[PDB]
């Protein structure tokens, strides 16, 4: 039958090609003997290259009734997982007669089920044997043992990750190709009487292994602790309910929502009876309390849980997974269980293998493979040269195989980590802890930097801007002063200022525990203002700098549904501040007395709602003083008559004081900034204007569905401005119709899904590049937008408060989370200080780390090539450097200079340039290759100079042991040492991205120490340093000549690195198109932006 099934996964990003290969063959025993007798074929090579393994142990089977199946994805990486066996599952609707021995796999927490009649694998779990039937069956629960029959087919609500043991992570990390080559090199060094440097590399590699092991373990702990939850639910069945843990029920079980201990909803469940009040802060990003009505039979019979999205009417009938309950206001039947739920499908995308778009740690190993390919040729040449001189076979093998180790240094990736580690230490010093170090270098190449106006660049709680008085004496509203003006104007029954100030702490339930109120944050902020808050008794503490006393009685609560609250209580005199009313300007101005209206009740409300502020109405009910008595009880509807408003109280999301400076710094540093939020567009645009994300006096355009239908694959968008409307945009080109002023386009969240689902790719890319404000965006839409940014070559980073939207933090290149160090989960970075000032710190230290990591890579490659040249110039006479000269070079000239060249802070000012991030492009390889060439030239000239001296001691070809005391060994030792120290000097970064070498001490001091030591060894070595290091007597004028060669090499290398090799790189770039004129593609966002600014805006 059919063998290979090529289907895309439900999420567009991931694709796979499931291929059902056979179990094994009789040849498995032949496989075992022939690949484990050597010990380095099966467990090493066929784990690194699975393609061949599966082409040996297996042939093919169309019939998917085998023991294990291999999985192929779009990134050419294959894993192997077996087939799980279950005895009995009779209904066909479970996968959708009788079915036996179901075949199933779980690949990256995707459950694939094989259906026998159709002979195919499916991942859709929408129907999943619903059997709801009618309401009376739904309330009956689920009798019998069928819960177990509905358990093994779908598992529990637990969404815990695959907790790999230490023995599995150990063989996953320690068994890399490199860490095998390092074991080979250490074995060679131990066999070649080279113990000290081998022990040093063993310690360094062990430290790297422990660091990576603890990093991965902490990452798994963070991922596991975030997604775990357990609670004792009360009901499974209608008959004999009893409290069981939430990791036990199956789809079809019914549980009481009104249980007192049920703080947050375990699994999504259709509401059978009663109403609920839920909080959706962490799914869909709305902290406003949401009502939930019980589901009806008609809505229950049309359930299609296959699609993650759904219509709006179904949303108000089933609960959400992992959402906090505001108050226990009810029983509900679960719809789905496990990773296939609303929160499950969003935690599954956080566990998929990342594409690893940062290719520096892959390009370094690719160039290491290239050096290994060169080292094979070097090994062959050394072998055939040593055959000519007829040396001992042990020494021939040792020298020829040691040349391979010299060319490919085992300490290159270990010294690629020291600069990153220093950057991590500096960041932890600056009170920002970063988990993944490898992302720090990615922070260098940040092109865009997203945000979130919930609590990141704005304060979390709502804040009061000012007040608006009724001004009954003069209908024109007075200017706001944000202070007390009670005695300034009379405006004498009551005063609007005193009445409003009494209202500010009247109609809300407030209480204290220690210093801070316990009430809802909407009402909490109001009392602090003017410093006349009364909580206990009646009177309060008034400031010294003649205000009437305070007092309140007959308190009530502000119902969000009816949006009204009235409190009557005498406070001063007999008819002053007696009735105080809180409400909303939506409907109560119609109820308000028309004489009180200053004819500004509507346009001011409209202007403040367009400005995104929150307006609440302050009113004074006109009731005579004759209604005061101790036993006073009046229903709300009796008091509610009248209620003319006497002012407006204004709320806003006041931005942090340093947000504007950070946004301006990022904009001036040629880094775009966007805002991704979940609240209404009216305040997101205002916050963007305040911060500087949208330029001042720049029009903001939103798309609307007016020109077409609503949704569902057929609509025509009209892009209209916020201020000064009827300035449309072309839906096909996104240009300002003149029927370069900054476009500042602000899409919404539902429209963004419309455009992603069905719109021209040019239109999507134009909006995506032009986008500045993204409001009403769920975290799923947040990560979709982040992936779209990565899809148009933006290397964007995310900067979000808390860890609710951690999917966007993990999907982005840099995931800075402004939360506590222990409260942060699934985020590469974590900042204790809650300002957004940490983004310049992260970007700046990332740029410094990127530059110093490229410098360390170039220095390590130069060290490898210099040693290869200085040993290949000596292998022509069966000689090499000494056992201690190699030690000195490898331990006191490359490791100290590397770890002290990687020790410098970043330049304080964020420059407008961007460091090079490609390890293959001509701006990196050409200076490195030219440095290799000039090092080879200087060493060759030193060798030629020493070969013509009268006191020359020629090397002697020896068989048993290679002689070291020859006059062309000392020259190639000292010239090599100078070419190491001065290359470390030259390749060190300077002003544009890191601290200047003059401004930092422990690099200049290290260079001075390692250069003075070598100079004293060259000029005046003691007697104990001759026989120890195997030097040879040299002329004093020749020592001066060696110093001159070192200085000339320093001059030429510095002039090349700064003034000449960049010109050579530009020359190769200019002559690139003479061979293949096709212009290498730039970033997609750069192309779209330049085309849009030039061609589409120069056709007026």
Residue numbers in the entry: 203 to 298, 315 to 547, 558 to 719, 745 to 798, 826 to 1019, 1034 to 1394
Text taken from the publication that reported this structure:
P-type ATPases form a large membrane protein superfamily that couples ATP hydrolysis to the transport of cargo across biological membranes. Ypk9 exhibits ten TM helices and a soluble N-terminal domain (NTD) in close proximity to the membrane, perhaps involved in lipid regulation.
Spermine uptake is accomplished through an electronegative cleft lined by transmembrane segments 2, 4 and 6. The cleft harbors an additional, elongated density compatible with the presence of SPM. Equivalently, completion of cargo-binding is linked to the proceeding E2.Pi state, where SPM is accommodated in a cavity on the luminal side, coordinated by conserved acidic and hydrophobic residues, including the conserved VPPALP motif. Indeed, the NTD-domain is displaced between the E2P and E2.Pi structures.
